[PDB]
Design a protein around this ligand. Structure first.
Ligand SMILES: CSc1ccccc1
Ligand SMILES: CSc1ccccc1
Ligand SMILES: CSc1ccccc1
Ligand code: FES
Ligand code: FES
Ligand code: FES
Ligand SMILES: [Fe+3]
Ligand SMILES: [Fe+3]
Ligand SMILES: [Fe+3]
Lengths: 446, 192, 192, 446, 192, 446
């Protein structure tokens, strides 16, 4: 397949070829043009707060060690020995000043440097150039209010610019709330779906909620529960959708601070969020204080998703075109009482974790939509994302980005896939930029 | 067990061992086997309401954890060691049961098929609460659905059971430390 | 069990439950365990003639079904719900046994290896036929052959056993509703 | 591999490269040139007799919904939602007026039309063109005496013409018997063989029976039992072999009406078939009435096989080059007593079903022959099908098609593989026809 | 069993059958079940020193063989039929235990997870050594490590147990004929 | 990938691209350029000593039958029927005068000839040319002191020449000891590693022993035990490394006759080896008699390895780029007492067999080093084998081949990978020779 020419996503992001969820050659191509190029979620400050603390993380199919340095910074390195390629670290988290390879005993620092080689003097003499044998380092590591992302491509925009118009929506919760903590360890489960299936769902899919999650809505008594079985449509003005230049997007459901949490947490959460909102009005204004306590379903392009207020935080780690390893953490506000944080974390896993009953509703949808992309008669078929097309705006006086002023639509699908196509058909960041110089105009056509 | 000598043994595991090695009561082991076989039968036929009514105590904690992989020699890193795949009280189990029974739970059509294998049953009365029964058992749980989906779960269960309404022994605590860190079964949406 | 409330439970499964929850006879459960363990031992060592002679009654129905996947809400479509993977009388079991023992059964060289795991044994005398013993049990059956072929079967067995020649209890009915719709084991050529 | 030029099947179908059973690139090519082009078995009238009745079926690796329309016709559609590609139907059979997608709740009719979209007015307004969003329909659906076949290629010959000379042999049992019913549900088992291994075996392999099935012949006491361990050769005139332009073929074993059925059914069946034959003599003549009660081992090209009289009906559903999902039904004559039909159906499954002891004899043969096609030193080796070559005829006054007047030979292999090669090297039906204009001459050479 | 008639049965398997079919002692079967469940518990929590001290006799032979695939009709080829995956005396088991417990056994960090399922327990006293207990049982052994490595072992165990120090019954022989010829579990580094 | 041009191994064998352990296209290419071209281990005289004795063996991914002929020679044939490709032999060893196919009953002799075809006269008449239908024969089968190797390529050097300078080191144990026997049957286990990972480890990796095998060294009390945890370095003059033109190489650890065997065998073995050495001094000289009782870790290129004195004998049978089937036999000296041979064989399996505790130490190292070769950021990375480079010699007056006069180094890696690269980039043996005309000069540079 010629990725320069092949139209995998049609103009304005209106449709995508179904093969994108199934084609292994394209998956391999995504390793280069999506995962090696873009910002990927690694960890949070709260999980590696002290010098020497480390975790392992996936970046695409690669594994990295992410380590807190003595100077307070974070550096990340390929989890691969520079001698004969053995995996250095076999655990998920810990604290150490370095990592020793179990094959021939080479010792690397937390800073990636080759610090020791057994019997170096007797074996190598002065001939081993250890300065050139440090672990292969992730070129870019940056923080968004404690959330640590990495990028293998030195040419990438800074993380903040990459978030584009999405940052404005995230800041009330990520910054102005006083800050979030990530509660680990994550749940980890393999699903037989393409990574794009859950990514697209979290970025922009409110339409599915009442139907897909009918049983969880009816059974859990959460605040979006009026939707069960499409019994009722969220009223006019219940929310909006947004998307951005580099592909990140989200839905906003106004005021939905208790999110998917069952009635056992609703009064407590609605009290807490409302109290903080009242304080925030004076600081960031009424609209942004309201956004703080509004439910955001967001994907940070390509494969990091979240539900704010619900507190669900996801990494869709790619394995192959029909295999994804799902990591699920909880996010909590730092100034919440500890007992509330604990219950919120359990509730995140209860609803969206490995035995999350809500997430279970999505399984067959994501897996079969993905697997159908391999089927002969479906490869060249068109997945539709035209809902709300022709009603999006850009440059609004209040809400930035390409915005659909309605709670349910496919605005964020279009922006996600516009960026995806621009990357797949480009060889580097400069070409992506050239392919994106009229991004908002393309999305707001007709 | 001396865990200073048996270097791989956790304090918790050593404590649980001691419970069963002492006062062996053959009648109790048989009662426990019956209790667990009947519980597994109810679950296998998806009689979830009957399971709640007959097997689960009002004060239950039903907990399945997934423990982060850490170095055997680790002693500095102190953050949350595990997350809760399940950590349910009775009302939370009821929510999950209603979710299973809801006619708009699309994933349950066509009907799932469950088969449970319960083995290695041990039972011992609590030393201090003469009405608290400790039961340990292992489960293989086979779930088949949709023609060719087959998921097999493996676990050890540390239970406490206590006489409740009508003198019926019911589950008041189940604790499972799930042995596979990354699930390869699509989800853990089964009652271990 | 109230199957109007426990929406996922079949009438058949509810009836089978009732059988065991009532008059528990510990001695019977132990007899049943012995009967089934010995049966599995004979099958595992491929003593098929001994299995017929010692374990299988002349009036046996040995039945394993595969049920078509239908909607949970289905109530109009009425055609044959299941096919018979096995539905054998004694003479038909004998044919299968002779096929296993035939020296020109090429697939049996090199010799197959079977290992059976029988669990969850329950036993109850029939209410009306005081000589009819109902036994329920679950089986994991592992078949290995030809270096790297490994097939694992999982099933629940609803048996009736009755005293026959010499007072020996023998299988007069086995019913298995096989839980996987599409087999991933090359065939179902094993005696569950 | 260049499929225009590569000789995968030699002249006259005399041999085939062993790689055809193992090569995944060729499997992918077969999806286009074999499965998307030819007639594939779907279901029988007896399984979907009433309006709204449906089943799912595979066509190659694709899955379709096959539905009885209100007007009595049958239409078939891809089991894939037109919105974002989720699998519509998760059951194997049922009755419904339509199918609702569990993702976003789109509702399709039994006629494939998009009938409803949740909240269409509020979300899409008048902008959703539902008339262009019907399920992707199988272009051709036709019946052969109740047996329903589908073809994705509008250009295919009618099913009757496609059966070619094979139809003459099938009609006594399929038509003149008063009609057959298919007894469901089928057994379903995955084997580690290429779909062509069982297809070739059923189309033309009498040679294997005495040896492969020695144990089943000795143990079951069926009427072909004199063959066990090659103890005896079927006498001269015991049968014949035939093949046809579009690849279908069969063996005929004269008078073998009880087929593989154990002695428990032999007297009953031999009485029933003989009685009907006596009636049919007056209607279709002695030869064709005899064919009615003769055992036919047939493959309807590419992947549907049967044993008439035995009543075995097979679909070899392709998964990959060494994986096939085997569907096994029973066929019975409609006017048989119900109790006989029931016993015949059980006997079909007893012998050839998931625990079919006869079918078990074939496992290692099909699986290893297939898997050996991947092995380096065997890929370019030649599978032989020359038995009886130079003794076939065409245009016989009594028996039509390319015919070998002997019970055991490889005539039907040659015709099967001649058609296979003509399809693999052709881009469309017109090219197949051009490649087949001297089909019978090629098969009757030397 | 007549192995001239039951053509697939080995002389060894027929001999082992006879042992259990005769004098059934229900109390013995229960003792054996306890012994094996406790042994499996110690192994599962990786209490290998405790296993040696409490479960393994000083005179033990701990043997697991892998048998070469030969023709069912073979009677000329006479060379070594099997190799020993294990064939350990007490000191050799101790070496393996020390290897497991060594802090530089890199493969044991992060800590492995074991779950054992013991079924089909049969027990019979030796005819001639009234202090020798024959125990047969089957094991499914599940080993999980390093996120997504999962290995499942299946075997039948022919044991002899004898009263040792302090009257504690200990394993004096275990024999396993491993049913899979080519292992698909990375290794057989588990105590069956 | 263009194998003529791609530098997979750098000059002097100093590094290799990590993708060589992961790339499936290269694995397929190795089937042609490595496995179909080179000498592969089949069996030993001791396992098929009598006429009609046979075993099955893998040669690459192909399976062969290896049979003792009536004239005392050994011939080997593809385990594939010449009719329709079924696997002929399903057992691992036996005695027979021929092999009959279970499909259609064709009978082949132990000499590969098609001897019988069921009902040949009635079916084929005189038309079947059985003389052209013998099993596909392995072109070359040769013996090195009872160890039988095969090669599919008629153009290969004789086995003795192929062993090159390695033969000199093997002869004291393989020849002058009076001869070895192979004790079967082998252990067989699948590991998730590339075949090259254990091959490279056995050919030249002494560096790993003290660290990788720290626990086995500490626990077993063997004679190399001073190495545990890198507690001590083998003293100067403790051993050497060698490599050869066609890729075979080994380490020599002087005097280490009890090898990995636990203390229970040490006194007995050290007595036996020393006594034979004393006799051999007079026959082959002091140096070569010493080599006899010195521990050799050797790979016979490509995928046969051994530890002499320890008695471990390995075949790393390739399955795919990250899958290898490991066969483990024991080697014993014929004139050892039978009881010692038995205990030695058990000890070989105890340490390096399916539950070999030493071999278990290597699992994660080989598997992860292999699997990392598939990871995107590691494919183009360089595995290093520069230890000892610039200190190797050729043409030494005492020790032949390219030799590093030190116990620990990477000399044998360099020679292994030099030959590997020369084969991968060559179309035939003549091209390999042309690519190897300055082999020792390349290895001894700098
Ligand atoms: C995309 S998941 C979700 C859940 C609840 C509300 C909105 C979105
Ligand atoms: C191809 S199967 C078969 C069985 C019986 C008779 C003829 C053919
Ligand atoms: C390559 S394995 C090994 C073991 C012991 C000594 C030397 C090498
Ligand atoms: S591979 Fe890490 S030290 Fe050699
Ligand atoms: S995928 Fe079917 S309605 Fe959206
Ligand atoms: S495939 Fe071997 S005789 Fe036909
Ligand atoms: Fe959802
Ligand atoms: Fe057959
Ligand atoms: Fe090693």
């Amino acid at each position: 397949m010629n990725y320069n020419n092949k139209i995998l996503v049609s103009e304005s992001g209106l449709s995508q070829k179904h093969l994108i969820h199934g084609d292994e050659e394209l998956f391999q191509h995504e390793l280069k043009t999506i995962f090696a190029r873009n910002w990927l979620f690694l960890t949070h400050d709260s999980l590696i707060p002290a010098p020497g603390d480390y975790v392992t993380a996936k970046m695409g199919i690669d594994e990295v060690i992410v380590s807190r340095q003595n100077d307070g910074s974070i550096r990340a390195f390929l989890n691969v020995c520079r001698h004969r390629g053995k995996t250095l670290v076999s655990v998920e988290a810990g604290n150490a000043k370095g990592f020793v390879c179990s094959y021939h005993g080479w010792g690397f620092g937390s800073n990636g440097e080759l610090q020791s080689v057994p019997f170096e003097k007797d074996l190598y003499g002065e001939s081993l150039n250890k300065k050139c044998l440090g672990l292969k380092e992730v070129a870019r590591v940056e923080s968004f209010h404690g959330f640590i992302y990495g990028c293998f491509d030195q040419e990438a925009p800074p993380l903040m610019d990459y978030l584009g118009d999405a940052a404005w929506y995230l800041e009330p919760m990520f910054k102005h709330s006083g800050g979030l903590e990530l509660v680990g360890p994550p749940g980890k489960v393999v699903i037989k779906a393409n990574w794009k299936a859950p990514a697209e769902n979290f970025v922009g899919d409110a339409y599915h909620v009442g139907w897909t999650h009918a049983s969880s809505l009816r059974s859990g008594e959460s605040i979006f529960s009026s939707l069960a079985g499409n019994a009722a449509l969220p009223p006019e003005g219940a929310g909006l959708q947004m998307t951005s230049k580099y592909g990140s997007g989200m839905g906003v459901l106004w005021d939905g601070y208790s999110g998917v949490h069952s009635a056992d947490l609703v009064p407590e959460l609605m009290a807490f969020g409302g109290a903080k909102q009242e304080r925030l009005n004076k600081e960031i204004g009424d609209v942004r204080a309201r956004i703080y306590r509004s439910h955001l379903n967001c994907t940070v392009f390509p494969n990091n998703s979240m539900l704010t207020c619900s507190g669900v935080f996801k990494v869709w780690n790619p394995i192959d075109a029909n295999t994804t390893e799902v990591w699920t953490y909880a996010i909590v506000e730092k100034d919440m009482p500890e007992d509330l944080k604990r219950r919120l974390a359990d509730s995140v896993q209860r609803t969206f974790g490995p035995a999350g009953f809500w997430e279970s509703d999505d399984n067959d949808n994501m897996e079969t939509a993905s697997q159908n992309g391999k089927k002969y008669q479906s490869r060249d078929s068109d997945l539709l994302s035209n809902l709300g097309f022709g009603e999006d705006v850009y440059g609004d006086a209040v809400y930035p980005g390409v915005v659909g002023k309605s709670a349910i639509g496919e605005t964020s699908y279009r922006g996600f896939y516009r960026a995806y196509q621009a990357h797949v058909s480009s060889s580097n960041w400069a070409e992506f930029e050239h392919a994106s110089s009229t991004w908002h105009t393309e999305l707001t056509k007709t | 067990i001396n865990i200073q000598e048996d270097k791989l043994v956790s304090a918790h595991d050593a404590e649980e061992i001691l419970r069963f090695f002492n006062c062996h009561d053959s009648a109790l082991q048989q009662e426990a086997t019956t209790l667990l076989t009947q519980e597994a039968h109810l679950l296998d036929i998806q009689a979830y309401r009957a399971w709640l009514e007959h097997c689960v105590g009002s004060e239950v904690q039903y907990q399945v954890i997934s423990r982060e992989l850490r170095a055997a020699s680790e002693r500095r890193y102190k953050l949350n060691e595990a997350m809760n795949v399940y950590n349910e009280n009775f009302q939370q189990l009821k929510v999950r049961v209603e979710h299973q029974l809801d006619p708009q739970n699309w994933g349950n059509s066509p009907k799932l098929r469950f088969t449970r294998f319960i083995t290695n049953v041990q039972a011992a009365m609590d030393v201090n609460d003469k009405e608290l029964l400790h039961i340990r058992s292992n489960v293989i749980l086979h779930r088949a659905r949709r023609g060719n989906q087959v998921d097999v779960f493996y676990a050890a269960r540390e239970d406490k059971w206590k006489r409740g309404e009508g003198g019926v022994r019911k589950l008041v605590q189940r604790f499972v430390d799930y042995p596979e860190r990354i699930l390869q079964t699509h989800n853990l949406m089964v009652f271990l």
